[PDB]
Structure 1
Amino acid sequence: SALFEPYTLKDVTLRNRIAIPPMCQYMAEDGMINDWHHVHLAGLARGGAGLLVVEATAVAPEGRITPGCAGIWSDAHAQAFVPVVQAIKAAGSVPGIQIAHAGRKASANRPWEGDDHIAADDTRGWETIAPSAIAFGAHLPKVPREMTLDDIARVKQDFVDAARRARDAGFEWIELHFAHGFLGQSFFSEHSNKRTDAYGGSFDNRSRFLLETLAAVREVWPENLPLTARFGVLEYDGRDEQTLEESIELARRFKAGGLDLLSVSVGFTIPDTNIPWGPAFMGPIAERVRREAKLPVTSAWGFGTPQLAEAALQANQLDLVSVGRAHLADPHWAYFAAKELGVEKASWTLPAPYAHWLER
């Protein structure tokens, strides 16, 4: 099975091609993770996936999505990850982390607590920042503050500090969150970036925040550990071909700047879109980016059956298959997939205290 072939990137070898993508848990307190995250992540790692990427972890307090988001904006925050990293490694999975800044989509309620911008008089809320003072709209109506050049310098340094902390906590894989309408994505998109300084207007200027952040992170992140990013390559906003062409050009510049793999997603920059959700719907677009930028990729949003996953790999659409919600339903999804694909000794996807009893 392609799904169960190992994958090597830089000095890191994954035991199979199943990746667990970052999935916010909304269970942290002032950015500090706790036993929710410890058990959640260690349990997933034991389930058999080759790579486990920790949820969007804010580089600064105002870059959380919600009051429940994880953070890594101080050394105390980073140290809270150390036992979890150690538990993920003990299970034989590779520990990764997504470092993030929510931009204009920050200061929101948890998804089961309204999913909307926090009310102005709620003591939990805060001012958001963005390239330009323009609201997302819909359920996120708060107008963000337009960043100064000093804000841009500060947030870049926060990404550097976050990467340094992730390194020193023992993570073996990092992902810069430049997708999903958050700060990085919003610098790239003309919908959200109306700046007329060096960080807006032209393709080079809109790209600048992302490329400078990548380069700054590259200075502290070890050259022997994968350096990756998530990026929304189209919006489904009626501008898809032009947007995909620019996104591919940016992917080429990421590769030239030391990016080892790109997680290909949708932008979610604005609400007025028509995303054609369906099984493996991102496969052809991931494949195009992989081919035209000559860069390894993963994607998600509907690959969560063993057959979809296997087919995407065999077609060389993807290098790793990210499987999210299926792992919330069943932390041992990788074992389920091994059985379904007829892998020999499928139960030994799991550790011995489970595998011995499940051998059929």
Structure 2
Amino acid sequence: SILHMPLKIKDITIKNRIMMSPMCMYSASTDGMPNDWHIVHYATRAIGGVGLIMQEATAVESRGRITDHDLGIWNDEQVKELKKIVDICKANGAVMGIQLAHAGRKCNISYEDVVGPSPIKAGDRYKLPRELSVEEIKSIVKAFGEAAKRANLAGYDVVEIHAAHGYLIHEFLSPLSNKRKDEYGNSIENRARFLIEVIDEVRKNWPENKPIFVRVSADDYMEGGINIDMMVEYINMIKDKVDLIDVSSGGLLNVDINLYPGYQVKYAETIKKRCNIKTSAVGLITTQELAEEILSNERADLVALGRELLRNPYWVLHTYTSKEDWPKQYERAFK
């Protein structure tokens, strides 16, 4: 299958084209520490043959968590514990990625120091965010850098910057949430500035031979917000600094959209073609058939599975055509 073809990005070789999409498990301590639940959860999909396991949103500051049961990488003590996830997944044959995240105004911890580009709530249940100063923005850029340094110490192969789903970076990118009139607002170049500074600071702290991904929301599904043309312009600003765009949509504000298998694939293909950059496709993909169509028609370079890998952790094993491709311990169960 084309899904079984390797993809080399810088010095990292991913053995197949399936990525486990980053999915929060809301199972960490309030100190952001992983536990045996995470270790088993990720190892299971490594065992199941996933090429690239992207760890769930891991907060670069405590106020950048979504919930107070999220994973963190805002301090050095978290490194030794996250390394346990990295080591077991790599031992079982996966490339390990980490999604570096900051929830911004969508931080749902009522007691946290919630921040954003402009003082507008994510919704009625949320705390009003403090409007960030330029000084504070610089400190958050620094925090992404330190998180990348820690990720490298923990042994992650790939870093992803979470610029999607209504969180901090997306909030700067969208005119619907960014009403700033300083150097981080108004013009498209200014709205992109925070993302660009984060990328630059991550690269200062990330080995040049390891890849950087960026996850984006390619559509806000709302007049005056991000649309595919706007996202194409943003990706063109950063394509010389990052390796692959993990293409999603939505999350900034509540919107009813049409959901169906592959509903975000056109965004992935459009970015891939217009920007000439590698992309990942995600969204209601569950079958080998659709995954193969996406890859073979060159609509994306990787296929990300989220919910399908929650219910069906060995999806990739079931696509193999010989028992020798299975874990030796499970060879006898090949059909």
Where on the TM-score scale, by shorter chain, does this alignment land: which range?
over 0.9
1:353 to 306, 329, 332: 329
In the TM superposition, what are the counterparts of 1:251-290 in structure 2 within 5 Å?
251-256=235-240, 258-271=241-254, 273-290=255-272
Is 2:117 the counterpart of 1:131?
Answer: yes
Tell me how far 1:107 sits from its aligned partner: 2.4
Counterpart amino acid of residue 227 in structure 2: T
Matching residue within 196, 202, 213 for 2:187:
202
1:270, 1:13 → 2: CA distance?
37
Match of 1:75 in 2: 76
What is the CA deviation profile of residues 261-294 of structure 1, one whole-angstrom value per residue up to 9, with x for unaligned ones?
A: 00011031112x2322110111112101100010
Instruction: Provide the C-alpha distance between the structure 2 equivalents of 1:64 and 1:141, rounded to a whole number of angstroms.
Output: 13
TM-fit CA distance, 1:148? 1.1
| Corresponding residue number in structure 2 for 1:146 | 131
Asked if residue 89 in structure 1 is aligned to residue 90 in structure 2, the reply is yes
- Alpha carbons 1:173, 1:226 under 8 Å: kept: yes
Give the residue type in structure 2 aligned to 1:34.
Answer: N
Q: 3-state SS of the aligned residue for 1:247?
A: helix
Structure 1 position 239, deviation (Å): 5.0
Find the counterpart in structure 2 of residue 25 from structure 1: 25
Contact 1:303 1:323 in 2 (8 A): yes
Query: 2:52 touches 2:95 (CA, 8 Å); kept in 1?
Result: yes
Distance in 2 of aligned mates of 1:60 and 1:227: 20
Query: For residue 296 of structure 2, what is the aligned residue in structure 1?
Result: 314
Answering whether residue 84 of structure 2 is matched by residue 100 of structure 1, we say no
What SS is found at the alignment partner of 2:97?
strand
Q: Would you say 1:4 and 2:4 are equivalent positions? A: yes
Deviation at 1:238, TM superposition (A): 3.8
- Taking the aligned partners of 1:245 and 1:51, their CA distance within structure 2 comes to 29
Please tell me whether the aligned partners of residues 129 and 144 of structure 1 are also in contact (alpha carbons under 8 angstroms): yes
Q: Distance in 2 between matches of 1:238 and 1:349?
A: 49
- The letter for the 1-side match of 2:170 is Q
Q: Distance in 1 between matches of 2:13 and 2:77?
A: 29
CA-CA distance at 1:349 after TM superposition: 4.1
- Percent identical pairs in the alignment equals 39
State the shift of 1:130 in Å: 0.2
Structure 2 unaligned regions, length at least 5 = none
Q: 2:259 corresponds to which letter in structure 1?
A: W
Q: Is contact 1:48–1:349 with CA below 8 Å preserved after alignment?
A: no
Task: Classify the secondary structure of the residue corresponding to 1:163.
Answer: helix
Matching residue within 243, 265, 280 for 1:298? 280
Q: Report the Cα distance in structure 2 between the residues aligned to 1:145 and 1:203, rounded to whole angstroms.
A: 22
TM-score by length of 1: 0.90
Structure 1: distance between partners of 2:190 and 2:122: 21
Deviation above 6 Å: which 4+ runs of structure 1? Answer: none
| Pairing partner for 2:228 from 241, 244, 254 | 244
Q: Distance in 2 between matches of 1:288 and 1:220?
A: 31
What code does the residue aligned with 2:3 have? L
**TM-score, normalized by length of structure 2?**
0.97
Please report the RMSD computed on the Cα atoms of aligned residues, expressed in angstroms: 1.3
CA distance in 1, matches of 2:324, 2:302: 21
Unaligned runs of 5+ in 1: 109-117, 119-124
The separation in 2 between residues aligned to 1:59 and 1:285, in whole angstroms, is 28
Q: CA deviation at 1:306?
A: 0.9
